[PDB]
């Protein structure tokens, strides 16, 4: 269909707090090692004062921390979710279906992604590289999209409604029951990957 509204609102949510886009990619690369990430480590990678790392993370209210206050989850996460994101046999996780399509390009790694259809519980899997998706199972796999909302917890507002589905008709059947969701739309996983490529292209533009 036409996915500009989703690209627009995703970019605005990242660019709404200065620093977020510039912290996101280095943080995702660190989390992809599979270990908790300290604020001190992040400040050193960014060459930022600690107070600036703090102020950016303060606005990212969905950030997940461990017992030591290390970062363990920001889109990519060490804590188990419905979206399995495996790189180099390290099993990591993602907050939503679209995250699994976006991250490989940002971290420069190929991921074996797996989940379950949110309508039928059927297993779904695919391989996501920086440039392409392969081994899409089922081939007709679909994704739900909603419009992110201003100054809402991004994970309860967006990620929790962005699922994989076994097929577009299965997802549209599910979608008929959930019309209260703002801007709910069903797309193929290829369309969703294209949305991710457009997001990532604009994201890298706006980095320092």
Stretches 2-10, 56-64, 78-86, 180-188: which one binds Br ion (CB under 5 A)? 2-10
How far apart, in whole angstroms, are the C-alpha atoms of residue 173 and residue 94? 25
Strands, E assignment, the chain: 64-65, 71-74, 76-77, 83-87, 90-94, 111-116, 123-128, 133-137, 142-145, 164-165, 185-188
Least CB distance from residue 3 to Br ion, whole Å? 7
- Say whether residue 204 binds Br ion (CB under 5 A): no
Q: Which is nearer to Br ion, 11 or 76 (CB)?
A: 11
Q: Which is nearer to Br ion, 4 or 181 (CB)?
A: 4
The answer to whether the peptide bond before residue 138 is cis (omega within 30 degrees of 0) is yes
Chain position whose Cβ is nearest to Br ion: 2
Q: Which residues contact 137 (CB under 8 A, 6 or more apart)?
A: 123, 124, 125, 126
Stretches 1-9, 15-23, 32-40, 177-185: which one binds Br ion (CB under 5 A)? 1-9
- Say whether residue 2 binds Br ion (CB under 5 A): yes
Q: Which is nearer to Br ion, 2 or 67 (CB)?
A: 2
Q: Which is nearer to Br ion, 2 or 177 (CB)?
A: 2
Cβ(105)–Cβ(200) under 8 Å?
yes
Give the footprint of Br ion on residues 3-32 (CB under 5 A). 4
How far apart, in whole angstroms, are the C-alpha atoms of residue 186 and residue 172? 6
Least CB distance from residue 5 to Br ion, whole Å? 6
Q: Which of 47, 99, 153, 173 is catalytic?
A: 99
Contacts with Br ion: how many residues (CB under 5 A)? 2
Q: Which residues contact 139 (CB under 8 A, 6 or more apart)?
A: none
Residue 160 a catalytic site member: no
How far apart, in whole angstroms, are the C-alpha atoms of residue 150 and residue 9? 8
How far apart, in whole angstroms, are the C-alpha atoms of residue 105 and residue 38? 23
Least CB distance from residue 144 to Br ion, whole Å? 18
Residue 66 a catalytic site member: no
Least CB distance from residue 197 to Br ion, whole Å? 17
Residue 96 a catalytic site member: yes
How far apart, in whole angstroms, are the C-alpha atoms of residue 162 and residue 185? 10
Q: Which is nearer to Br ion, 123 or 183 (CB)?
A: 183
Distance of CA 131 to the CA centre of its chain: 16
Residue ranges in contact with Br ion by CB under 5 A: 2, 4
Catalytic (active-site) positions: 96, 99, 159
């Amino acid at each position: 269909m036409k996915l500009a509204p989703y690209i627009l609102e995703l970019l605005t949510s990242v660019n709404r707090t200065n620093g977020t886009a510039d912290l996101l990619v280095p943080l995702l690369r660190e989390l992809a090692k599979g270990r908790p990430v300290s604020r001190t480590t992040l400040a050193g990678i960014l060459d930022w004062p600690a107070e600036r790392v703090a102020a950016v993370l303060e606005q990212a209210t969905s950030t997940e921390y461990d017992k030591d206050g290390n970062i363990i989850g920001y889109g990519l996460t060490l804590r188990e979710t419905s979206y399995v994101f495996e790189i180099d046999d390290r099993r990591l996780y993602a907050w939503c279906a679209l995250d699994t399509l976006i991250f490989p390009a940002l971290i420069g790694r190929t991921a074996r992604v797996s989940s379950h259809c949110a309508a039928t519980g059927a297993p779904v899997s695919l391989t996501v590289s920086p440039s392409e998706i392969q081994a899409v199972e089922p081939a007709g796999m679909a994704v739900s999209l909603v419009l992110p909302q201003e100054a809402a917890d991004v994970r309860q507002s967006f990620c929790c409604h962005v699922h994989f589905f076994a097929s577009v008709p299965t997802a549209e059947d599910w979608a008929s029951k959930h019309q209260g969701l703002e801007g709910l739309a069903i797309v193929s996983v290829h369309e969703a990957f294209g949305l991710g490529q457009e997001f990532n292209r604009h994201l890298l533009q706006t980095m320092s």
